[PDB]
C-alpha cells in the first residue's frame, strides 16, 4: 500500500501539466518530503521503488521548476538526519549542482558550506564514500564563487579527518581537499597552501607521526602531484 | 533558464539570423527582457563568476553589433572596454570580443571616425598578441583602400610602436602562426614607415636578458628572423651596409663569452652582418643538440626551434644565391 501510495503520488505530480502554480508548488513540496520519507523505510522493495520514482520526478521536472526543487532539496540536506536519506539526497543534489544559474549560486554556496562541515564529520563510511563524488561536483559548479577564508576553513575541516583509521574516510578527505583546490579561485596559491600544511604535518621526520596520518598525507599528495604541472 | 553554453550560442546565432533577415523586432513585443538579461550576463562575466565564457562571447558581440545596425556602438565599445580593462586573460575574452567589432565596423560621418580612432587606440593597447595583428592587417588593408596618407601615418605610428617591442622581446612570437602574421603585417604595412633603416637595425642587433630560458631565446631569434626577412625583402644591399657603417654596431655584440655568461647567468659591415648570422646559426644548433627533450624544452618548443633554424638557413641560402648581396657573400667566403 505504501509502494502504490508513493507511485500514485508520482503519477499525480507528473500528469498535471500545471507548472509555476502555487498550489502545484505546495503539493510538490509536501510530496517531495513524502518521497524522502518513502526512501527511509527498511526494505529492499520500498527504497528501490521510491528511488527510481524520485529519479523520474526529478528528471521529468528539470525544465520548468528547478529552483523550487533545490530549495526543498537543500531544506532536506539541512535536517542532517538518517544516513540513507541524506545519502540519496546528496547524490541527487551534487548531480544537479550544475543546473543552477550564476545569479543564485552565491546563496547556495553560503548555505552549503555549513552542511559540508556537518557531513564532513559523520563517522559513517557510506556517507563519506558517497561524499567522494559530491565535493568535486559542487566545488566545480559553485567553487569559483567563495572567498579566501571560507575555503581555508572548509579545507581545514577536511584536513581534520586525515587522522582517522578507516581507509574510506581518509581517501574521501584527500580527494575532497584536492578537488577543492582544483577549481577554487586562485589554484596555485591554494596548492602552495596545502603544500605548506601537509609538509607542516610531517616536519622533522625523526618523530612519531601516527602512521595512519602518514598514509593520509601520502594519499593527499598522490592526488596533488598531478595538478602541479 | 539554461546553464549549458552551446544552447546559448545557438540561440544567439538564430537571433543573429532573425535580425539579418529583415523581420521586425517583435520577439519582445512590449518589454526588453532578453537584452537586459544579456547585459546582466556581461556583468557576471566581467566579475569572473561565469564558467564557460570562452565559447559564448563573440556571438554575443556579433549579435549586439548586428542589432545596433538598426543599443549604440559606444555601448558595445564600452562593454568590450569593461571586459578588457578589468577581467581575465585576453586571448579568450578581449580579442574574440574585438573580432566582430572590428570586422563589422571597418569592412562594412564624424562619429564613425571617432569610434575608429578609439578602436584603433584599443588595438594599440593590445598589440602584443598576433590575433590583434591579423585584425590590424584588416585595418591596414581597409585604410589602404580609402586613402594613402592615413595609411602611411597609421603604419608609421604602429611601426615605431612595434619595433621597440621586438627589441625588448615583449611580443608573443612563440608560434609559427605568430611569425606568419607578423611577416604579413610587415609586408602589408606601408613602405615609407620602414624606409629609414635606423629602427630596423637598432631593434635587430640586440641581446636578450638571459638566454638560459628557452622562451627568451625563442622570442629573440623570432624577432631577428621577422626583421631580417624585411631587411632581405624591402631594402637593398648598399643601403643596409652603409647604415651599419654609420652606426656603431660591433660584431662582438654576441660573442662566445657573451653567450656563455648569459647561459651561465676597424670593422666592415660585411663582417658584422656575416658573423651575426653565422653565430646565430651557432646558437640554434648548439641549443638543438645539447638540450634535453622533456626536461628543458617542451615538444612544441622543439618543433618551433627546429623550424626557426630551418627558416634562418633558408634566409642564408637566399642571401648567398640571389646575387643582390655580393659583399656579404665575399665576407662569408673570407669568414668560413
Curated annotation (Swiss-Prot), chain A:
Expressed in the brain cortex (at protein level). Widely expressed with the highest level of expression in the brain (nerve fibers, varicosities, and nerve endings). In the brain, the regions where it can be mainly found are the cerebellar cortex, the neocortex, the striatum, and the hippocampal formation. It comes from the Eukaryota. HEAT repeats lie at residues 107-144, 149-186. The modification N6-acetyllysine is found at residues 79, 137. Disulfide bonds: none annotated. Belongs to the huntingtin family. It is linked to Huntington disease: A neurodegenerative disorder characterized by involuntary movements (chorea), general motor impairment, psychiatric disorders and dementia. Onset of the disease occurs usually in the third or fourth decade of life. Onset and clinical course depend on the degree of poly-Gln repeat expansion, longer expansions resulting in earlier onset and more severe clinical manifestations. Neuropathology of Huntington disease displays a distinctive pattern with loss of neurons, especially in the caudate and putamen. Lopes-Maciel-Rodan syndrome: An autosomal recessive neurodevelopmental disorder characterized by developmental regression in infancy, delayed psychomotor development, severe intellectual disability, and cerebral and cerebellar atrophy. Additional features include swallowing problems, dystonia, bradykinesia, and continuous manual stereotypies without chorea. Some patients manifest seizures. The N-terminal Gln-rich and Pro-rich domain has great conformational flexibility and is likely to exist in a fluctuating equilibrium of alpha-helical, random coil, and extended conformations. Interacts with PFN1. Interacts through its N-terminus with PRPF40A. Interacts with PQBP1. Interacts with SETD2. Interacts with SH3GLB1. Interacts with SYVN. Interacts with TPR; the interaction is inhibited by forms of Huntingtin with expanded polyglutamine stretch. Interacts with ZDHHC13 (via ANK repeats). Interacts with ZDHHC17 (via ANK repeats). Interacts with F8A1/F8A2/F8A3. Found in a complex with F8A1/F8A2/F8A3, HTT and RAB5A; mediates the recruitment of HTT by RAB5A. This is Huntingtin. The gene is HTT.
Curated annotation (Swiss-Prot), chain B:
Coiled coil: none annotated. Expressed in the brain cortex (at protein level). Widely expressed with the highest level of expression in the brain (nerve fibers, varicosities, and nerve endings). In the brain, the regions where it can be mainly found are the cerebellar cortex, the neocortex, the striatum, and the hippocampal formation. It comes from the Eukaryota. It is linked to Huntington disease: A neurodegenerative disorder characterized by involuntary movements (chorea), general motor impairment, psychiatric disorders and dementia. Onset of the disease occurs usually in the third or fourth decade of life. Onset and clinical course depend on the degree of poly-Gln repeat expansion, longer expansions resulting in earlier onset and more severe clinical manifestations. Neuropathology of Huntington disease displays a distinctive pattern with loss of neurons, especially in the caudate and putamen. Belongs to the huntingtin family. The N-terminal Gln-rich and Pro-rich domain has great conformational flexibility and is likely to exist in a fluctuating equilibrium of alpha-helical, random coil, and extended conformations. Interacts with PFN1. Interacts through its N-terminus with PRPF40A. Interacts with PQBP1. Interacts with SETD2. Interacts with SH3GLB1. Interacts with SYVN. Interacts with TPR; the interaction is inhibited by forms of Huntingtin with expanded polyglutamine stretch. Interacts with ZDHHC13 (via ANK repeats). Interacts with ZDHHC17 (via ANK repeats). Interacts with F8A1/F8A2/F8A3. Found in a complex with F8A1/F8A2/F8A3, HTT and RAB5A; mediates the recruitment of HTT by RAB5A. This is Huntingtin. It comes from Homo sapiens (Human). The lineage of its organism: Eukaryota, Metazoa, Chordata, Craniata, Vertebrata. The gene is HTT. The chain holds residues 1438 to 1803 of 3142 of the full protein.
